[PDB]
Amino acid sequence: RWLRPTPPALDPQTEPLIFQQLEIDHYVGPAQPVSVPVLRAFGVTDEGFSVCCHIHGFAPYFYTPAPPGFGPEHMGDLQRELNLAISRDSRGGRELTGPAVLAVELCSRESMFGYHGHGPSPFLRITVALPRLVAPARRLLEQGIRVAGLGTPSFAPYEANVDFEIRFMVDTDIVGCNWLELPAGKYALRLKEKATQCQLEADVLWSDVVSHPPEGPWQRIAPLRVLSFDIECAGRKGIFPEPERDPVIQICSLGLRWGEPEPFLRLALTLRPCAPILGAKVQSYEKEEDLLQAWSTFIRIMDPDVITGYNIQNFDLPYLISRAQTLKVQTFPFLGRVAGLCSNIRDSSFQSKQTGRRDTKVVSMVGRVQMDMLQVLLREYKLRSYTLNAVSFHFLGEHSIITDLQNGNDQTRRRLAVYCLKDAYLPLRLLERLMVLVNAVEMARVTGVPLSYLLSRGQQVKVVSQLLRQAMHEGLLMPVVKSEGGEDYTGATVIEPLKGYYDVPIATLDFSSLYPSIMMAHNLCYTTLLRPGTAQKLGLTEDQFIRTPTGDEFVKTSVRKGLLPQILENLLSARKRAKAELAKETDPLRRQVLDGRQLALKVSANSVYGFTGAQVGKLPCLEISQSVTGFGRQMIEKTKQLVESKYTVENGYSTSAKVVYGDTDSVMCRFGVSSVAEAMALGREAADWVSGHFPSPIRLEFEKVYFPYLLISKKRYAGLLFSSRPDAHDRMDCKGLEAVRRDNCPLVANLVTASLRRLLIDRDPEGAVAHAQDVISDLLCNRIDISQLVITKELTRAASDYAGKQAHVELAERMRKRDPGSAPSLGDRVPYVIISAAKGVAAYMKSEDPLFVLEHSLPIDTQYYLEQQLAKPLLRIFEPILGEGRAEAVLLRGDHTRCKTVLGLLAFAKRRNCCIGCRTVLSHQGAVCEFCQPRESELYQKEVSHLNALEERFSRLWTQCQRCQGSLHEDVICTSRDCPIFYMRKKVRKDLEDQEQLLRRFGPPGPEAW
Amino acid sequence: EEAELELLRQFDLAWQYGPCTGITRLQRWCRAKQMGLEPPPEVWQVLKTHPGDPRFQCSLWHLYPL
DNA sequence: TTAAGCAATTCGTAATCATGGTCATAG
DNA sequence: CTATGACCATGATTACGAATTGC
């Protein structure tokens, strides 16, 4: 629809180009100037034109040591290494490499690993023509033949085999989303006859570019173009949609320029004639071929930078591609920027111990960038459900019906289009509100990796990139060590608690950035690790090296500076600047998203240390990891000895303090005073006192005062939070307990939060007992919503769940009769509830889908929920304040309340009536019993105040759907399984149905036909 | 039949007769006739040549827990 | 060709081991 | 018609894997 502005008057012999790049690309090419791999770079100007840039003359290489013989110091054998062996038996050694310009170069460099000296050594630099020839050469120089005139006897290892685009960016100092400049007279626009579809197309040599480091005025962001879209399909009853039978009926698109607070384009393409919508364009077609063609032409002409959505990768784009393949439309799958290239669906998997394992499809688009917001949420955030409704409530606050809204009239289709446009608008709001893209651009500028790697890869490519960028400045080469496999080492210490309930303030002192500052201030690195022999026979121990608790020796900083101290120092300053910016916000959600930014930079700095100990990885050095955790243990026991030893009764202070807890970075010391001001004063004195026994940047700091405190086990405690004194209290802290885990029911987590509220804030155990009694009583009397009963568990890799029978695996692998095409896959979460049956050996035989027990009305196992979900967390919490008469107190508060329980063949009812007063079954329909008659006005009085309260609950719920829907004049259709509103509006109809019929036992209060 | 099942499905979604997914089909036909909006005399003449069948004398979504 | 670490607590299922109610037949 | 231990049946203890959170 709307086009980019027109590039007026660029003349290359006088004017430069200044543009900001988004994507890079590799390309094997003809039309050479009179190398074959030429590079592509796509970007945008400071105004809004689209620029493609072709870069020429770059070829991959690596290094290898020159062996000590008469060969690789003699030029005849250098060019003979270039020369091929013409023998017949060298077909395995000069064919797959063959005649390639590997070349011969002599340079003086060093290896990374260890500390041998300040002296370098000769290495050979071996270029290669193509990037897809470094793999057979590696298969032909190490295990292949290297008998060539006795120049290089086998073997010499390969060093610095890295990726092509990463080697380019390490070479020329270009980072992700960078400002690039072509100077005047260096670039030719009309040298390249147009093979792509951008406006400006330059054709430059790889030594002409100028990279501007992002800082000062070069810290801006260009006006990018962002698209979001959503589709609709018309299915059958029960049957989930399939790309060979179910047509695509509506596509809806939103588009904006980045930096402007509203969109500028709003389009909706439908398949029958429709009705107009104010604010958007509407076009209609009588066939699906025209609809797919129209969308492909719009996406070529608008030419967006970024494409977003929600689950567009695994549902939307391959559905469109398969549907275009079935209907024989040849011109659809050309969505990219290159004019002669069609797109294809390709599977990929990712797995780690940090995010688990996920299997995704990818679809190829060259030039353009994809950001599915579902994958960003699934990677960064740990939530309970990952539906669009659930995250839109958590962050903002909100198939067979559609097939008859489309086979109807045109106002129904207009309603369908407004629904689809709201769906297509929600991920834009989430992208701009959560500060996604600004943090992605800052991550790519601090680490130096492209913008497509932050959605596909892990935390290794970034630390490899930063280490290579720091390695070119002193002249070192990296080695290739690979081992399967070493052993584990010893991790962190935890101090033994003094368990219980405390009501005198405890002050928390901890170290900030512990492991990066250990690695900084004792000069630990790959490049300064001293081997056990190379100290000998030199004897200089003092101020030349140090010794660690695991046992290594490491050189002092008066000889070398390591590489990991400098990378860590850069990351630490970036996080410090993020916190300094975060210290001046007032909005809460903005404060937590800047907390998210600084959390991400601290995770990056700690993954630098975790790179060293990963024995399945790219470069492990477990000696360093052992030295780190040994220093950690030594320093925390130093802290505990010092804190408990100095402030004592004989040293003039009030009370000798005693440490109650410590977990590898923090110390919770109990001081003795019950005044929060005096505890805060002594705690600040203690933190600042103890910090002066270390190198720098090692510092201990005061952080909080808990008052009161509740310690249950290791990694399980709770307390109340004081930041200042006249800032009285902030909130609770629930570390580890049953209120922050997601393996349980909402009922149990709510009861634990409410019990700690009534028990820690108001200090009333009697209201707490009465609360827990009411929860258990309302459980047994069958008046608890089934939202509070839903359990969710993650469906991981299928073989570990083959090894032992679980409940959620049994529910998932059991398909439905309605739909063998929508079922949980690997990596998602399965929700279930437990119904009552008589198979007590197996709780995996009583699990059912919440919607299935909704539509089929199966009962609930109240004894399962009473003794297996609720009871034992309560016995954790309520015991330490009292004795074991407290277990008997809650099991007796159960006992007064356990005696109140509410209740094929089911069709053959008799429906025996019963007396309302004393429950005696009898013949006739009158409500009262003959012995309980003198008391009937009171029994009518009783239960009409129950009908009165059910009437008041019907009306508050069924008009809330009208305000959440938007309209007051049309029907509600919302079966949202993540809304408590749904199925709480279903049971009050039946409560009212039952309670209205019980009062017609009594006669009518008058006539009605008068 | 199979042509009489689309006439009723077309009467059920025309907005000028009312917002009807809680009641029967013949009750909505007589409600519009009282106010006399314009009920057509064909959605009546198939609700008379049938008995109490639940796929003629019921709204489209008379399943569906809404 | 691809993947940052360790410590600790909780719950469910099958298997191992203890103990009583019938029973079957020798006295 | 009546003792005795062999036989079936039901409940208490231990072991280990899976899931998830704290540093």
Ligand SMILES: Cc1cn([C@H]2C[C@H](O)[C@@H](COP(=O)(O)OP(=O)(O)OP(=O)(O)O)O2)c(=O)[nH]c1=O
């Ligand atoms: C959270 C976390 C901690 N650690 C280690 C490194 C840390 O130095 C040590 C302390 O944990 P943390 O206190 O969680 O982190 P931190 O001390 O480095 O930073 P800050 O005080 O500002 O919050 O625990 C990891 O190795 N990986 C991790 O993911």
Ligand code: SF4
């Ligand atoms: S059931 Fe009602 S309140 Fe709940 S999400 Fe649906 S429309 Fe909104």
Ligand SMILES: [Zn+2]
């Ligand atoms: Zn009675």
